[model samples]
Target chain A: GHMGTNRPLVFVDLDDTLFQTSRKMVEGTPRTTATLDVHGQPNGYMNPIQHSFISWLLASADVVPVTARDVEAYSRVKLPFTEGAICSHGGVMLHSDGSLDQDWHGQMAKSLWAFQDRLPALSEATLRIGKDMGYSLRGWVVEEEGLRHYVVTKQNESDDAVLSKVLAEVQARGMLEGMHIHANGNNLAFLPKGLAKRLAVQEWLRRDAKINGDRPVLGFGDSITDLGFMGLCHMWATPARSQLAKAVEEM
Target chain B: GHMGTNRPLVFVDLDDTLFQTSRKMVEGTPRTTATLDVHGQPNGYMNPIQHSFISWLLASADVVPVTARDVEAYSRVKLPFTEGAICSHGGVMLHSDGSLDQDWHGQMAKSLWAFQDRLPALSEATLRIGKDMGYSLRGWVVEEEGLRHYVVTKQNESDDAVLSKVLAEVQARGMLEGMHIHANGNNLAFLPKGLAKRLAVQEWLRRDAKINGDRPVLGFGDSITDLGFMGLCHMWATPARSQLAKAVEEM
Candidate 1:
């Protein structure tokens, strides 16, 4: 029950927040490997500064990773995260022992039935629209541990016009009423309204409160999508040059 | 020479970064007292979120405060800051014992002579223009621990036109060459190039390198002025809805 009596709980986003694609890195700066490919080759890296930040976070709190990556992709990340992991944007929850949290899994299965039926058609429509507009794209419904969760589409070219055309076509279909659509650069994701990283984090807090009295919650994120979850924390932080930072500046 | 060997150094801006004005606080939100006035009355407060953030920062690393508040003003803050403090926009450095670092004091005194002579004239010019424009304003040259570092002007009312007119007049004087000018809602500050929070933090790192091996540096700030010093750190964080966040979003 009352585990790590005084340790605070920190919910942090991976990717752009902790480590990022090499192209996003500063020019001429050397970076350390943060994640590896299935072949054991370096695929993701963090500059020395990010490594130090990660080191400090691990030392200070019970770090719970809330990431958009699926469990298989998250496994390649080299950080030692043991408290818990919320993957697939809250579509999947893994316990500290690396086993699925059955309660959460069952809850999602019950809640996601309606969205699951429409996801396949919606994903296909998105891909077809992109292809008709002379854009190379791929769409797929992501399933985690045998449970269907969300739909994602990626364009081969980072063309705003092509993405916008596809988005307009998708909106015209009107099938995304109960879902959430997120388009960032060349990637697009459609998640069910019942699923969210914030909900996952809140669930964890609720369970933890049953054992531990009340722990301070801190969060770190870098995108507009992360705002919902980060706001649920007692305090939140944003890295420099992040999507959320841009949003803050606009405010 | 070496202090807190292997422990990382965190350079953090005080005012808007750690805490902010009570007016900026959300309505009906509970806040904790962060600083007191000269008469021992609470003058500054941090929301519950900021309090938790500060607590985490204290637990994680050596936090060195970088603030615009002069020595006397900084002392009013109630937090237990054991590491050194940078004050007066980096014009003054105070050791953990609450005494002035004579070496830093002497260096600033030597470098500030030219700016000191111009500060009085600049302050008078600013006030004269504000008065001519029918704006109630007061300007003063700020001195800390016997060192004249910068000039500041405050308007009684928050009128952008009046402040902009005064700023235009000040710029016309061309006295701001090789200096820095910062204009907020009702306050304007002019500081010599040598008196910057970034410079002071850099000086501290230079001295720290002798006694400690390479230490990871992190910074947090909320204003555009803070960008200089925050940029020097290995990593940096910004609070939501801050001036720096606005800048990040604009980029």
Candidate 2:
């Protein structure tokens, strides 16, 4: 209906955009005391040769692995394109004949558990608008995962300027009913607004390759939480020691 | 710290609340099975008192199962309840020892494959603004189990207020962006508001009942999509007549 034609899907993003590692260990990635044994345990690791050259550039097309690790640590990082994937940051979807799709993770976990059960009386009215902007509220914690959710804190020492001044004082005290907090990395992340991961890799390349019309995607990343899924691909790479390879070499 | 004398915990909901079917050819009552499986295929059916009440609700607590059956129809509906589970409707998380989470089923399969890649130009701009409000569209189909996502449409003149006014006029004609279209039965899903099963039963009751604290959750269902996790739960029931007891009582 919307005039089609554009489908060469290819997402790839595991760890350092093709596995190298160290974006603060992509949120706690240790497992490797010789991949673990006796007791002082830890178990896996190994993604180097640019994940075996994007596992042969996802065996030549129709590839998908967008990550943020959370589907049992993205099945302990195996990716030879384990049938389309897109964990956490996109929320989760690992199909391609293995199955798993969560109606947008059950309406973003019942709208983030009804927006954190109505955010603790809007955190005492944003602690009196954070005492006229002197900044002191610091206390939410939700964080659940699966049907996905987030609401952490560490008393705002600039989690992006207290998540945009506590989401503009909870949307001018109407108490920001509409959600999507942001900041992630020193923590903040309320997220749900336009549920990202580059509109989830454009919904896995529009139902796995625009109703079989196939060809026109190529995204790979390393972070700024994968800048909106590498700005909606069509050639966006990141490897040569990525930090999203200097933001895909300055895009 | 959202204060209080807290104390209630215990979230259970596995196939029949913790097993108890021991087969009989899994007879009738409300059974109806064009196929949700059981006596039709996938390991037919059998309950065994919900498998010894899930080995005695796992000797005390931590037993998250919340089902809508999806990790491949909850791995062929067999009850054992090892530890974590909140299939499909929340998209994916099968932990109870076997392990598998798929971050809300890969963000509900990349926002329902980026809303079926803008459902053919939003179903051709809702068949040219509902060809005089009579509208038409066909079987768009999308389904998954691990990082859950589901989209359907076998077309019986596209119901549910013509698929919610053609998904709110293909989302105010933005040409399908972040994805989140619902309606289920008559089809038209587009999902990714963020994985659910009541946020994967509150992340298996906060990481497997972090040190017990209050504990005691019990839930079981056989439908209206396990009512956002049997309404959270202290104890929930279902399974008197069974097809998994009317799929939680006619949903």
Which candidate number would show the highest lDDT if scored against the true structure? Answer: 1
TM-score of 2: 0.23
lDDT of 2 by residue, B1-251 (tens): 21322333335544433332324344552221212354446433323323333343344344555654556556665544565666655666666575665665565565455444454554455555556466556643334532225443324462556767666765776755654453434545554455556766766666544554333344555433444555555333344443333332233
What is the C-alpha lDDT profile of model 2 across A1-251, one tens digit per residue?
Answer: 22343323557666544444343345464322112223424443433223334444454446777765556656555444646677666766767654567665664565456555455545455555665677665644333352334443435454456656666656675555565554533444445554556766777666654465434455666555665665565334344344433332243
Q: What's the true lDDT of residue A5 in model 1? A: 54
- lDDT (C-alpha) at residue A36 in model 1: 88
Model 1 chain A: weakest 10-residue lDDT segment is: A1-10
CAPRI-style grade of the A/B interface in model 2: incorrect
DockQ of each: 0.23, 0.02
Model 2, position B15: C-alpha lDDT score: 43
How well docked is model 1, in DockQ terms? 0.23
